[PDB]
């Protein structure tokens, strides 16, 4: 049976939560890949030096025994954050990058951005010292419809953002629409993205024919088919500022299939054998490596793995579900045969 | 303070399920409701005289003494159903109307049932259509535009004398067809197309509740609607799709489609009409577009609806799990007095 051997993956785009949470998904990343970006949105949110240090070493903490894994840490930016406490932690090594989450009027200044205009003076921070931002790329007005606020975004925010900051380097999130692909793939040496599973392996009918299925209900929403074949035709072309970024976002079980479930697939441990499996349809293995392994470090000028790792094309059942202390975690297939694994 | 008295209603769009759940849910309907249309799809389906006959029986029996409430039952079309088992039932007064449901027991083809139809339209029994296409590559929310454009007008056009109920209509596509239609084109509309879209099944979390066949649309959808049934055309009427399913059933891995309505339906229609500055048209919706497109006479008695906020439970009680209704927990501003 075939096999794949690769550069060691780093994982541009993870949700680790904390406490217990946390102790029981590390290791699904740590044992596969070299770093990943670990987001901010914690309740509260890390917004400081402080509070990403003593996160880095819970993480570090559950780790197991000779796994090769750095946390990347980043901050969540806020109305109230003060651009030298971002670039304090930028220059000390601590941030790698911060992360903007969706503008709401409403936010409390400590957890979140009212409006992009308003936190200026922390953007021009991060161009001046070369800091990537990292953008969930949608406008959550509640008079625009779901499948519609990664397209505004674009029009309302990303360009005009670019236009005015023109050396900041931005990855566009978890991106899930041709509006996005075409965005992205016409866009400068500074402009990059990360590509969940979720987005390129199903659209939407997934979620909703024959049944509501929250266990694909994430944010960005899925979208129309034609959306998903850009995202996947983007992948395949060998487009280098795409890359591997999971969004592995784990909730509890009961908190999934409950009367108002919450967004996130928790697909850390198929996430790669998932990708193998869409480069493979698209007949475009050639790019599978520097997705997952070159296009990443090369964006965000950092070193490419220096070790290998292989995937086997052979057959596997996916867990129907992961024990925490209490509830149980659903991965991303659970219960189904998968394609490829990691040897 | 404010009433509002009205003719009493029916609802022309119903599934009563069977067994213990039958039982929780008719009271609901039977207390409000002078009439409804029975539902068909049951498991398995009513496709015979004989079941449907028991199955009226088993709803009767599960009537509280008192309310004066009949079953209007139909039967569940079938690619080999027999023209003249269909025939008997109505002419015996048992089969008010025949319910195609597009295959995922149901209808493979219109061509497959044709004589079927054909009779209906020589007998004058209204059909009534779930008017979506099901290949797995049309995007579901294109669902309900595609079968009108692709079945629903093909077959008016070839059964030019058959009476269709376009059921639970959710788009702007439907509205307008509908809207344009003959005097043998009506259609249903649950109080959930009315009062959300989307976004409220979407936004903020996954809402199964709100989840229900044809799938809630984008906004533009919600308020071609809303407009349709304001404007006081006649061939629009109460139909709630109440869809009941047992909360572990809605909240699960894969969750069941339609929302438990019947608690809440006249009141949530009722504030609908009221936001569109279109209550002189309520009754007319609740009480007596279906009556005039059945040939059944309107009710003879009356209900009061109250501008009181009243409540809505968390949940039902059932014999195993609860039942959660539409809109548990919240606030409705109108309720049914006494
Ligand atoms: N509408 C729904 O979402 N559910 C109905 C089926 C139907 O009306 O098609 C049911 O019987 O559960
Ligand atoms: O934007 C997000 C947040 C993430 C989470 O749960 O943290 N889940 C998602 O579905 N996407
Ligand atoms: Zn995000
Ligand atoms: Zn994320
Ligand atoms: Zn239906
Ligand atoms: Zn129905």
């Not at 392994?293 to 000028?301: C, E």
Request: a negative charge.
């Amino acid at each position: 049976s075939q096999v794949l051997k690769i550069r060691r993956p780093d994982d541009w785009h993870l949700h680790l939560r904390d406490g217990d949470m946390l102790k029981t998904v590390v290791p699904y990343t740590s044992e596969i890949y070299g770093r990943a970006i670990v987001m901010p949105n914690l309740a509260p949110p890390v917004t400081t030096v402080e509070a990403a240090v003593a996160y880095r070493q819970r993480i570090l903490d559950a780790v197991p025994a000779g796994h090769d894994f750095t946390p990347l840490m980043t901050c969540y930016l806020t109305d109230s954050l003060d651009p030298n406490e971002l670039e304090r932690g930028f220059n000390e090594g601590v941030f790698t990058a911060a992360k903007l989450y969706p503008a709401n009027a409403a936010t409390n200044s400590s957890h979140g951005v009212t409006s992009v205009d308003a936190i200026m003076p922390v953007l021009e921070r991060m161009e001046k010292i070369g800091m990537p931002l990292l953008v969930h790329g949608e406008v959550t007005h509640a008079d625009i419809d779901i499948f519609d606020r990664e397209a505004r975004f674009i029009e309302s925010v990303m360009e005009p953002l670019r236009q005015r900051l023109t050396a900041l380097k931005v990855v566009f999130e978890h991106i899930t629409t041709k509006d996005a692909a075409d965005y992205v793939r016409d866009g400068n040496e500074r402009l990059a993205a990360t590509i969940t599973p979720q987005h390129l392996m199903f659209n939407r009918n997934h979620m909703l024919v024959g049944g509501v299925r929250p266990h694909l209900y994430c944010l960005p929403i899925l979208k129309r088919n034609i959306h998903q074949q850009a995202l996947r035709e983007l992948v395949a072309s060998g487009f280098n500022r795409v890359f591997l970024g999971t969004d592995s976002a784990p909730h509890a079980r009961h908190r999934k299939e409950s009367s108002c479930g919450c967004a996130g697939c928790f697909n850390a441990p198929t996430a790669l054998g998932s990708y193998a499996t869409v480069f493979e349809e698209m007949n475009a293995l050639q790019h599978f490596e520097a997705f997952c392994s070159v296009n990443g470090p090369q964006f965000y000028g950092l070193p490419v793995n220096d070790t290998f790792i292989e995937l086997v094309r052979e057959e596997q059942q996916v867990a129907e579900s992961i024990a925490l202390t209490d509830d149980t975690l659903v991965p991303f297939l659970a219960g189904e045969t998968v394609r490829w694994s990691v040897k």
